[PDB]
């Protein structure tokens, strides 16, 4: 994010009490779970500077409910599932 992304949230704060901006990534490369989440908050500082906004990082997770599971779970058609107990835990030990 460039430093100008703050005022966008400050403009739409009239729409929602707290607007969370989500950085995303169109091309997967690194390092892991894509995108990002930043919430608009005023933390001031321990140095007592005039209040400025440095967006705090919000942890992002990927999930689904029912139909959004149906689409992607059929769309994988790539790697074995899971398989539980053998390759799963050890590849996670690598990654």
């Amino acid at each position: 994010l460039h430093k100008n992304d703050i005022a966008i949230n400050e403009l739409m704060k009239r729409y929602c009490p707290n607007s969370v901006l989500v950085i995303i990534d169109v091309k997967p490369k690194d390092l892991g779970l894509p995108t990002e989440a930043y919430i608009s908050v005023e933390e001031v500082h321990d140095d007592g500077t005039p209040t400025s906004k440095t967006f705090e990082h919000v942890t992002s997770e990927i999930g689904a409910e029912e139909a959004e599971e149906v689409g992607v779970e059929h769309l994988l058609r790539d790697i074995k599932d899971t398989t539980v107990g053998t390759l799963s835990q050890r590849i996670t030990n690598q990654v």
Partner: protein, 373 residues
């Protein structure tokens, strides 16, 4: 109305020169270059009987012009109040300017700071905390001006002068230390400013060390002008702990206000060394002995209980004390500062973890890479 400003046109030699332009500014009916030129005359030190008379015409301007921000009206009223010498009639007129002016920009923050600046002679303690509490409450939205927060420090510092919870003065002076961007004022004031700041911040009981913010880069140039006994004893409270020569040297340098908090400082450094003794060693090996604490803190074996357990109440360590051999078992630690050449060794402790996991994990799946396919 014109003759009212014509009789005040001449304040002395050279004044009517620029005042020939000043009177030509309202003929074109521009009150802004007029605002900057009049405010410059108000900022110009005078008797001053010129601004006291012409403030009614400037009030007449604000009447039909209905616009010009109260900021300039606060800047002129703080110059006039010095010549008025009576804060009461100044409070009636300033609160009149507060109720008679309204704009999208909040005028309550600039008026309450002007009232707080004029409240020093009331003398204090009655309505102070109420309006002082209202300043930063109305400043929370939207603090983009940056100018009034220094005035908030002015009324908050004069609120602290009653003494006044020393521990709070460092937080308020922190607010000032971060409020103003460029100092743009002689260091001869800021050397004693950061001096009594170092006194009230060090003598505070809520802060036992905070050696980190002692190294803050904007105040370190102010400490360079200060004598080095204060900086060295601040390093004693940064690390120390005893270092009995430096904690006495601050008594050589600063006589007053130290006699009351001296024993508090001794307790603060006695609980300060407990984190640094287990932090300095590679350890852990976090179990210490009574001989280590009693020799360092030079206190009797009966008071080391109160010593280490008070640090457990401070929150810097959760450890437990083994009283059979009188040993002290520390747990966790309170991080305070650290240093240069530490980012390097940090890369050594990291890269070793890197090649560890890389090697071993690449050995794990090296065995089972075949069977996968």
């Amino acid at each position: 109305v014109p003759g009212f400003l014509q009789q005040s046109q001449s304040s002395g030699p050279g004044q009517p020169a620029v005042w020939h332009r000043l009177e030509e500014l309202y003929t074109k009916k521009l009150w802004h270059q007029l605002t900057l030129q009049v405010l410059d005359f108000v900022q110009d030190p005078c008797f001053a009987q010129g601004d006291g008379l012409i403030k009614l015409y400037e009030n007449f301007i604000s009447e039909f012009e209905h616009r010009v921000n109260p900021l300039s009206l606060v800047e002129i009223i703080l110059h006039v109040v010095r010549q008025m010498t009576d804060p009461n009639v100044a409070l009636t007129f300033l609160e009149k300017t507060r109720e008679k002016v309204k704009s999208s920009d909040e005028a309550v923050i600039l008026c309450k700071t002007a009232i707080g600046a004029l409240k020093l002679n009331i003398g204090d303690l009655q309505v102070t905390k109420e309006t002082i509490e209202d300043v930063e409450e109305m400043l929370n939205n939207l603090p983009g001006v940056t100018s009034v927060h220094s005035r908030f420090y002015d009324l908050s510092s004069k609120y602290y002068q009653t003494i006044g919870n020393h521990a709070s003065y460092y937080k308020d002076a922190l607010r000032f230390l971060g409020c103003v961007d460029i100092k743009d004022l002689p260091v001869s004031e800021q050397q004693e400013r950061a001096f009594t700041l170092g006194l009230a911040g060090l003598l505070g009981e809520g802060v036992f060390n905070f050696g980190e913010l002692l190294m803050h880069p904007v105040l370190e140039s102010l400490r360079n002008t200060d004598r080095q006994w204060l900086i060295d004893t601040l390093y004693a409270f940064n690390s120390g702990n005893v270092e009995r020569f430096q904690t006495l040297k601050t008594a050589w340098g600063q006589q007053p206000d130290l006699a009351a908090n001296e024993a508090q400082l001794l307790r603060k450094i006695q609980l300060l060394c407990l984190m640094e003794m287990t932090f300095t060693r590679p350890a852990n090996h976090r179990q210490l002995t009574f001989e280590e604490i009693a020799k360092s803190a030079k206190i009797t074996v009966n008071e080391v209980e109160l010593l280490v357990m008070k640090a457990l109440s401070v929150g810097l360590v959760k450890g437990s004390i083994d009283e059979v051999d009188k040993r002290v078992h520390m747990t966790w630690v309170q991080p305070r500062v650290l240093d240069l050449q530490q980012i390097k060794g940090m890369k050594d402790r990291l890269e070793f973890w890197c090649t560890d996991v890389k090697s071993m994990e690449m050995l794990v799946e090296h065995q089972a890479h075949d069977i996968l396919t």
